[PDB]
Symmetry: C3
Subunit: 81 residues, 3 copies
Amino acid sequence: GTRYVTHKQLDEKLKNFVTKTEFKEFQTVVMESFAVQNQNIDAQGEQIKELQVEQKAQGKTLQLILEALQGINKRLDNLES
Amino acid sequence: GTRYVTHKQLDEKLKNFVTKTEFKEFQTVVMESFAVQNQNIDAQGEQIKELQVEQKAQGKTLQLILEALQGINKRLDNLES
Amino acid sequence: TRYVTHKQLDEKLKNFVTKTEFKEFQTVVMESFAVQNQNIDAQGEQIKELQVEQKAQGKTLQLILEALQGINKRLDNLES
């Protein structure tokens, strides 16, 4: 086994290398991990979009209120001294 | 013996394979990175929840204002006959 | 035999992951984390935007509440 590699020497060498079995096993764990986190990230993006629309709606309502207050103040001043 | 692998050819061939050490290091950094992301994603989830509560709270305030404005307008209608 | 043939070696290494396969996956994982960071940063910005808008509107709402107080007083004067 001095010039060429023997089966015992190869097996011994291969003890320190990664098998396809181990590699693929880990790949599935990683892919499923990204899947669950990304699903959470997407769900939160959805909640944000929902908040954004309501925030604009509220800003619209507020603007209306500010106008109404101006009208109320004009009517009050109209009856004032 | 020309059909056999020499020690040098084995070493060269193994240059293109992964050691358990390299793989374990990668696994750890990856799983550990997912942990960090979990912290980040959950933190934003909590920030979103707080935005939701505040938006709902302010929405209620807006409705109270809307109710107030109508009562005012009626008191003004009565004053203006 | 007891010596490894070129073919036997090839056959055996087929059950081990190649450096190229591994490197490809590693790059894919790291770039995927990069994308998550991209989206997390973007959503963080949207969150900050909403936080800023809410604080602002919160201020205005309180002012409005006060304004209604002064309006009710003016009305009471005109009626009560």
